[PDB]
């Protein structure tokens, strides 16, 4: 029906700072039945100074900061045309270039005044990770309830132990009308927090995680990579497949919570800035979706930007988990991980290959394979290309000389993992 295919937007209006900090808010935002939530009056209720994220303030703060520009043809939010302008298509291609905040600002400001073109420029992926450079901005985001913050005990990304750019650091987007964010799910299905600084609106579209394989099938049919390509759903295709589509406007000061694995796309209707980062709540729902996308990525040779094995061990070492469903999932992941390390050690020892203990140091990143981008946990196959390259076991073995010239390192002895694992118990 027309009613079921156009579901109402899950919405919250905070009348007070107290309601912002209610446990009811966290349960509403993370409810699997709410794929996306818009929190009206969030900035006002928390007295957030969003002026700190105004274009004028940003220019003064770091005018020469790099902006990744996406050049796009301006089109209505429910349209994406082929080159002839006669039919709708899924692929939504852009050109990628670079400029500065100061220069993008002048373009943003000048277009805004002139309104008082066919081709537009979208200022993307602006990196607000530098804690000194963006101190007042980042400090302002400490006013949010804990579950929404960049860093918190209940956020899996706060147990990584190092920076994951754009996930546990804030990204800024500077927009003019028509600036288009193509359809996607977040890295490893992690939740996202997005605030419109404004002065104008953003239009949002979203589909429940449940339907993602159908959207992936459309992408394949229309010649674009679902996981890594740039695409814009044809709404009529979605409706013809009985897929409900959420549609709403995000006004200045409104916070959008993108729940785990929600497929979403966005278009600026006015001139505005957006800020965003990811959160991974420590729930069975989020953890399951994170691990299944982790496994699917490996099938499809796509890098998992969240190193889920590394993360699961860190969580197990420090966090008390009381939910039996989530505990079981983490416990299983850890046991599989120990077994996988063990198989590698045994085959290395059978081959007569030496393993050196390397250990871990503070702030050390998690490693990925240079050839296939898979997470490489604990047992590292290392080659000298000063410059060292890490490989997974398969790719190391595949080298023309096999393991000749490859040094194998171990970052955690069996006993280290066994002791961490044994201490990880279900909390009362
Ligand atoms: O419009 C907004 O306020 C939110 C923008 N969100 C974006 C924006 C964004 N990009 C800027 C938008 C854009 C425009 C045109 C082509 C490609 C892209 C992708 C990079 N990428 C991502 C992304 C990437 C990987 C995993 C998860 N998310 N998210
Ligand atoms: Co995104
Ligand atoms: Zn590999």
Swiss-Prot record:
Binding, Zn(2+): 369, 372, 392, 395
Induction of its expression: By 12-O-tetradecanoylphorbol-13-acetate (TPA) in myeloid leukemia cells.
GO MF: beta-catenin binding; chromatin DNA binding; histone demethylase activity; histone H3K27me2/H3K27me3 demethylase activity; metal ion binding; RNA polymerase II cis-regulatory region sequence-specific DNA binding
Gene Ontology CC entries for this record: MLL3/4 complex; nucleoplasm; nucleus
UniProt-annotated binding residues for Fe cation: 184, 186, 264
Major place of residence: nucleus
Quaternary assembly: Interacts with TLE1. Component of the MLL4 complex, at least composed of KMT2B/MLL4, ASH2L, RBBP5, WDR5, and KDM6B. Interacts with TBX21, SMARCA4, SMARCC1 and SMARCC2.
Similarity annotation: Belongs to the UTX family.
Protein name: Lysine-specific demethylase 6B
Provenance organism: Homo sapiens (Human)
Full protein segment contained here: 1177 to 1638 of 1643
